Scaffold this active site. Structure first.
Site, mmCIF file in Angstrom:
data_model
loop_
_atom_site.group_PDB
_atom_site.id
_atom_site.type_symbol
_atom_site.label_atom_id
_atom_site.label_comp_id
_atom_site.label_asym_id
_atom_site.label_seq_id
_atom_site.Cartn_x
_atom_site.Cartn_y
_atom_site.Cartn_z
ATOM 1 N N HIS A 187 -17.031 23.956 5.635
ATOM 2 C CA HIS A 187 -15.684 24.508 5.754
ATOM 3 C C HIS A 187 -15.623 26.043 5.550
ATOM 4 O O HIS A 187 -14.545 26.625 5.689
ATOM 5 C CB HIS A 187 -14.667 23.773 4.863
ATOM 6 N N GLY B 25 -13.039 29.201 -5.289
ATOM 7 C CA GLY B 25 -14.270 29.979 -5.200
ATOM 8 C C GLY B 25 -15.506 29.231 -5.688
ATOM 9 O O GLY B 25 -16.631 29.697 -5.492
ATOM 10 N N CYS C 79 -16.519 26.251 -4.587
ATOM 11 C CA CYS C 79 -17.104 25.475 -3.488
ATOM 12 C C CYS C 79 -18.533 25.939 -3.234
ATOM 13 O O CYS C 79 -18.787 27.141 -3.254
ATOM 14 C CB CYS C 79 -16.253 25.592 -2.223
HETATM 15 C C1 LIG Z 1 -5.132 19.479 -4.270
HETATM 16 O O1 LIG Z 1 -4.656 20.822 -4.152
HETATM 17 C C2 LIG Z 1 -5.531 21.893 -4.550
HETATM 18 C C3 LIG Z 1 -6.666 22.080 -3.532
HETATM 19 S S1 LIG Z 1 -6.225 23.055 -2.106
HETATM 20 O O2 LIG Z 1 -6.187 24.429 -2.494
HETATM 21 O O3 LIG Z 1 -5.063 22.475 -1.508
HETATM 22 N N1 LIG Z 1 -7.533 22.870 -1.026
HETATM 23 C C4 LIG Z 1 -8.468 24.015 -0.902
HETATM 24 C C5 LIG Z 1 -9.922 23.537 -0.876
HETATM 25 C C6 LIG Z 1 -10.299 23.101 -2.292
HETATM 26 O O4 LIG Z 1 -10.016 21.993 -2.725
HETATM 27 N N2 LIG Z 1 -10.827 24.073 -3.061
HETATM 28 C C7 LIG Z 1 -11.042 24.034 -4.458
HETATM 29 C C8 LIG Z 1 -12.155 23.447 -5.061
HETATM 30 N N3 LIG Z 1 -12.310 23.262 -6.379
HETATM 31 C C9 LIG Z 1 -11.334 23.680 -7.178
HETATM 32 C C10 LIG Z 1 -10.147 24.307 -6.723
HETATM 33 C C11 LIG Z 1 -9.104 24.722 -7.591
HETATM 34 C C12 LIG Z 1 -7.969 25.292 -7.090
HETATM 35 C C13 LIG Z 1 -7.819 25.487 -5.721
HETATM 36 C C14 LIG Z 1 -8.802 25.108 -4.851
HETATM 37 C C15 LIG Z 1 -9.996 24.499 -5.319
HETATM 38 C C16 LIG Z 1 -10.092 22.373 0.082
HETATM 39 C C17 LIG Z 1 -11.342 22.099 0.644
HETATM 40 C C18 LIG Z 1 -11.501 20.992 1.461
HETATM 41 CL CL1 LIG Z 1 -13.079 20.637 2.116
HETATM 42 C C19 LIG Z 1 -10.449 20.155 1.755
HETATM 43 C C20 LIG Z 1 -9.206 20.424 1.215
HETATM 44 C C21 LIG Z 1 -9.015 21.524 0.380
HETATM 45 C C22 LIG Z 1 -7.707 21.698 -0.274
HETATM 46 O O5 LIG Z 1 -6.837 20.850 -0.209
HETATM 47 C C23 LIG Z 1 -4.824 23.015 -5.229
HETATM 48 C C24 LIG Z 1 -5.790 22.142 -5.995
#
Ligand SMILES: COC1(CS(=O)(=O)N2C[C@@H](C(=O)Nc3cncc4ccccc34)c3cc(Cl)ccc3C2=O)CC1
Ligand SMILES: COC1(CS(=O)(=O)N2C[C@@H](C(=O)Nc3cncc4ccccc34)c3cc(Cl)ccc3C2=O)CC1
Ligand SMILES: [Cl-]
Lengths: 305, 305
Positions: free
Chosen positions: B41, B143, B145
């Site tokens: 991604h 950040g 990921c």
């Molecule tokens: C559930 O809502 C969230 C995640 S998000 O920002 O909306 N987001 C961005 C992104 C994701 O999860 N990134 C993160 C990973 N780890 C901790 C994170 C803490 C805060 C923000 C992002 C984080 C992502 C990647 C994939 Cl492959 C698929 C979907 C998503 C996605 O839904 C706000 C927590």
């Protein structure tokens, strides 16, 4: 999101671990530049441990009596001196893996990462705190002496602890990297006991702010408290007194969540009175005290949920 | 004495962390030999994430669109390919710090160390387990990921997890190092939820043995039980079923403490039906399930890496 007991990455410290042997005794050493630091009790036999005269034992040693091993390479000892309870062995090779470092003496309530080692080889890393009674609740077996505690804020490793002994209660005692013990302990096998321990109040408050930042408020109440009424109550639960210093230190977390320190103090008072009633706070059913205000700011988001 | 949530020493993995940038997106990569592995991604914009066609987005990219940074050195990308949900960037330089490694897919209940990274720089190490619902309870911010999970087997690092996302409940989802997700998750900005979780029974039993080894025996009783009777009890409290495999795996801990596995099951049954009655086990008021039988043996015997 999430909140874990997080240790610093141990790589910078792993590259400094060596094995020190003096006669029959083997333990861990910390090799920084051309010096290896280790507990001075490495020169003791089991018959010496009750009342050792370290100066008398040390004067009978030569450089070649100390065997220092870094990986599978033998280091040559070219000097030795004692600084308090730590032995400093000057070696003929500067450690190529020496990181940027400092030696810091920490205060009770401060946290640090411990790299547990056996025979100069790291076996694990965990986070822990300097208890108010100057002991640490570590996970250590025989041979772990010389294992170090550290913090890695930015690119510099601050060494704050070197392991020396286990007390009868199963808790641990050690020194700073200048060989000064934390607490009223000595490097003797004489009867020694940890004083009554208490909960680190400023750290429980910090952890309650961490729960607000991560979206949880079930424990808050509409009340406030004076600083003195809080201490009168908290000390009945074996909690350390909260000082004006602690209140000032919690200032940023208070501004970030919108909850005044003394209002969080009222919430803690109620929690101590009521228990959790089947609820958890950040996956815990106990009040956690091994996260400082600084740890919470480093691990949590700057945006409250 | 002591029992801590202990992670493996992270040094071998820290030497592999790099920063990968594609356009506006920046995340972490794992540099092993001449390949950098990262979540696919990284090629998505916020619009692409809603409904991405990764092959179509990838075909548009050239090698120079990917910026890979190892410390303060820029790596030259000479090729790129996709394997499931992981992007593989071929670089012109083999990582001199590449340790002996394997890519392993773990099962629910197995634990691993996570080296949390931001901008290709490690910020912390913590231990966690693959939950039965295939999520992990991590501590991750935006950040993170590309951060990886691993175990160490003698001198070989087994990479088992790469972080991809956070679910609305605050728990995390990711893949193995071949890009196969753990759990029914997909890499896209869409509503996804973790299924109902369960407690890892074999791990709670292992931790009860650890408490006994550490002198915590208040929960032991004179009773025994059967696999059939205990599995009815486990089913009722959202506990994972205990198999004959789990009983066999707990054999050494059973021999060390003198408590038969179904003897320890009757203790767990009583703890579930009646609670702890104000008592703690290894400083916890909850039944801990993120230590496997192997973790208990490794920590109670001091195995080094
Ligand atoms: C559930 O809502 C969230 C995640 S998000 O920002 O909306 N987001 C961005 C992104 C994701 O999860 N990134 C993160 C990973 N780890 C901790 C994170 C803490 C805060 C923000 C992002 C984080 C992502 C990647 C994939 Cl492959 C698929 C979907 C998503 C996605 O839904 C706000 C927590
Ligand atoms: C309370 O009895 C113990 C420790 S001991 O083996 O008897 N012992 C040896 C030694 C010591 O503590 N070593 C150890 C360090 N860390 C964790 C240890 C876990 C098990 C065994 C030894 C450990 C020591 C060093 C100094 Cl400077 C002063 C005193 C002692 C001392 O008392 C069994 C727990
Ligand atoms: Cl301090």
């Amino acid at each position: 999101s999430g909140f874990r007991k997080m240790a610093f990455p141990s790589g910078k410290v792993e590259g400094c671990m060596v094995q020190v042997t003096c006669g029959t005794t083997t333990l861990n050493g910390l090799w920084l530049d051309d010096v290896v630091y280790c507990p001075r009790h490495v020169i003791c036999t089991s018959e010496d441990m009750l009342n050792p005269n370290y100066e008398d034992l040390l004067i009978r040693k030569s450089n070649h009596n100390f065997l220092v091993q870094a990986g599978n390479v033998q280091l040559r000892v070219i000097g030795h001196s004692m600084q308090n309870c730590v032995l400093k062995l000057k070696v003929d090779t500067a450690n190529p893996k020496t990181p940027k470092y400092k030696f810091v003496r920490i205060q009770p309530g401060q946290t640090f990462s411990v790299l547990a080692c056996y025979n100069g080889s790291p076996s694990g890393v965990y986070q822990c705190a300097m208890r108010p009674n100057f002991t640490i609740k570590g996970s250590f077996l025989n041979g772990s002496c010389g294992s170090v505690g550290f913090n890695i804020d930015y690119d510099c490793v601050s060494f704050c602890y070197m392991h020396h002994m286990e007390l009868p209660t199963g808790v641990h005692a050690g020194t700073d990297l200048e060989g000064n013990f934390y607490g009223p302990f000595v490097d003797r096998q004489t009867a020694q006991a940890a004083g009554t321990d208490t909960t680190i109040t400023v750290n429980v408050l910090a952890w309650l702010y961490a729960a607000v930042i991560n979206g949880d408020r079930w424990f808050l109440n509409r009340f406030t408290t004076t600083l003195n009424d809080f201490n009168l109550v908290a000390m009945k639960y074996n909690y350390e007194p909260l000082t004006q210093d602690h209140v000032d230190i919690l200032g940023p977390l208070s501004a970030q969540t919108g909850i005044a320190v003394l209002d969080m103090c009222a919430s803690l008072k109620e929690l101590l009175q009521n228990g959790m009633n089947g609820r958890t706070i950040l996956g815990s059913a106990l009040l956690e005290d091994e996260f400082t205000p600084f740890d919470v700011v480093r691990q949590c988001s700057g945006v409250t949920f």
